[PDB]
Amino acid sequence: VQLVESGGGVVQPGTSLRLSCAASQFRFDGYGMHWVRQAPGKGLEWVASISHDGIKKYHAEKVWGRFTISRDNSKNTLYLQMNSLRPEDTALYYCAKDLREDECEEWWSDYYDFGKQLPCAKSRGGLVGIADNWGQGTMVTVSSASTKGPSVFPLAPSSKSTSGGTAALGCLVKDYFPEPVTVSWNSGALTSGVHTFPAVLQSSGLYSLSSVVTVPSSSLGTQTYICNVNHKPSNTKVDKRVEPK
């Protein structure tokens, strides 16, 4: 069994987009199908379901009136029409096969050539809501964003980021698109005690990450600390001074 989703991409709020899913290696028109989505780092969520024949349709409350599932059994294709897209529709969209076949219960055969079965006379089986095969999914990112280099804000060392002895300071790399950025300190001369965290995709559809470094609190008056931020998609390189308080 093989399911291959397509149609995803970056799209602005309020627009429309149609996802597709192509089925292979099973009898597509004998099985119901599902769409399931997963926002980045979050849980699975039902989106829509459709009977093997395309007649019965079911949609999740969050998408009522905006999304419509459909299928074309002459093309082994499942569709999801997504209108009036919202930032909270950002997610990986999975296509999934339903378990229960519209299984033939009575069929005749070519009398002499009885390896050839004739069109099914009677069948039964509808949607049971068990997703037995899943595609790898297609990503849909809803955001107003165009290629954008980051804003950088200092995370200043204070009495509340000191324990000792040691002080913590950092920079907040805010509102860039797309991934990735790289961060260094003092043009690469400071590497001990540095930690750069993976980004979060914000509901605004822009990324943010932070980088923090632990240093002697005695040094805060003598040593300059500068965080260097590279964003290749926008060809920007920025340096930000981080000083107390």
């Binding site: 699975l44 969520e45 999740a60 409350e61 809501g129 509340k160 805010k174 993976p198 979060v200």
Partner: protein, 215 residues
């Protein structure tokens, strides 16, 4: 827009047993079959259990499940490192939208290293960001094992739901884990409270950091 509640994480040593609960309501689990899905890191889900206790052909008898009243339970015995994954329960019925739901998901961790307690660092909004009419609190969590934390935010002593964005834990170079949580506030919200706190729970122990507009 209902949910089946699951524990955020469970863990055990190799060869041991874990259970994962799935708590719902009469409308979903109470009247319907429960199914379970396994999702390995970076992969698509795979069906584990259907019709409450039935295994598809490839699934070993180390996995079993049941239900009682409005709650379902998955059990994994002889736990092995390959079982590390997120596990989701689910119900689906044609009758009502509220019977079509997935659980919140449970990460199963197989413990192959000693526990390590997180370092937590909390930063307030910078003056520069506030001059731009925005405010972000930054809670950074590093050097912990196993790789699961929950983060809660408080304004004074009141829980804050809106504005929180938290990353999934990611393995560091030393094979421990890191994560971060961001609370987006307006300047007014930041300045109008006596303090904000980030509360990090790791293996049932909660540690807390606090920052205040008046430094």
């Amino acid at each position: 827009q209902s949910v089946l509640t699951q524990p955020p994480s469970v863990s055990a040593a190799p060869g041991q047993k874990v259970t994962i609960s799935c708590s719902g309501n009469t409308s979903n689990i109470g009247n319907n079959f429960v199914s379970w899905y396994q999702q390995r890191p970076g992969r698509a889900p795979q069906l584990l259990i259907y019709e409450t206790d039935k295994r598809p052909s490839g699934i070993p008898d180390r996995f079993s499940a049941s239900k009682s009243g409005t709650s379902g339970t998955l059990a994994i015995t002889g736990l092995q490192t390959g079982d590390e994954a997120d596990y989701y329960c689910a119900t689906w019925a044609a009758s009502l939208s509220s019977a079509r739901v997935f659980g919140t998901g449970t990460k199963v961790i197989v413990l192959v290293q000693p526990k390590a307690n997180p370092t937590v660092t909390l930063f307030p909004p910078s003056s520069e960001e506030l001059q731009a009419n925005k405010a972000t609190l930054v809670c950074l969590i590093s050097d912990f094992y196993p790789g699961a934390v929950t983060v809660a935010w408080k304004a004074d002593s009141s829980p804050v739901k809106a504005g929180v964005e938290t990353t999934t834990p990611s393995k560091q170079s030393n094979n421990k884990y890191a994560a971060s949580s961001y609370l987006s506030l307006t300047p007014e919200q930041w300045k109008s409270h006596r303090s904000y706190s980030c509360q990090v729970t790791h293996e049932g122990s909660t540690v807390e950091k606090t920052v205040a507009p008046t430094e």
